[PDB]
């Protein structure tokens, strides 16, 4: 076993996550396909089919059975080094990876200042819209 | 900073394990030339320079200054698969690794299964003797 902050790295522990995930047998998105690109499967009430990857931390939603897993994180994150990691799990030297672990612990950093950052703005939008109907 | 379990497999952290080693400086068996082999450092009262190889458990105390630590080793238990492992620790595959964790797992119970058995031992030949004791005499 690893410990649990390194099992998402294990590609057939990121398939377990697709639980109920719509695209199945015949389509292009399949579970191992958004798995093998890395993707985790993680739902909600609005966005049943949000799925995020587990290195960078990017979001995507709005599955379609045509969908490349592997295109689409192109796409939208292709500064990702999981997107470049060309040798599997086992191949990988502790060197390589305690690298990997690390850039993926700024990304997730970088995720959450970005948060912390869009809360601050839409609080803002608020404070700002107090103050004016205040200041009428 | 990887996990407990996994840390004296890191020459330094075992290193670290050496509190109150005798043998500094001057000497063959130092606590570097210690964790190098595999050693870690786990004095009990009886033994105060008691050390333990953290991958095959093999225990060994009363060390002179020109002991050579790697040839101790290499002697009280030449089947330890850490003496053939060449590469640094950062030089190694996880499938590498993984597989000499999963062989030190089995160390592990080796060690614990034949404590078991010689303390189970002990405790047969007590109660061989007290049966005896009454089934004689009376
Ligand atoms: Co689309
Ligand atoms: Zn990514
Ligand atoms: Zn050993």
């Not at 996550?17 to 292009?28: D, Q, R, S, V």
């Not at 396909?33 to 909600?44: D, K, L, V, W």
């Not at 690390?102 to 200042?113: F, G, Q, S, V, Y």
């Amino acid at each position: 076993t690893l410990p649990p902050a390194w099992q998402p790295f294990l590609k057939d522990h990121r398939i377990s996550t697709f639980k109920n995930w719509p695209f199945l047998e015949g389509c292009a998105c399949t579970p191992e396909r958004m798995a093998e690109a890395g993707f985790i499967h993680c739902p909600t009430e609005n966005e049943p089919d949000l799925a995020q990857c587990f290195f960078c931390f990017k979001e995507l939603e709005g599955w379609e059975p045509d969908d490349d897993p592997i295109e689409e994180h192109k796409k939208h994150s292709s500064g990702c080094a999981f997107l470049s990691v060309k040798k599997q799990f086992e191949e990988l030297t502790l060197g390589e990876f305690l690298k990997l672990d690390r850039e993926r612990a700024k990304n997730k950093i970088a995720k959450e200042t970005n948060n912390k950052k869009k809360e601050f703005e839409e609080t803002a939008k608020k404070v700002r819209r107090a103050i004016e109907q205040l200041a009428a």
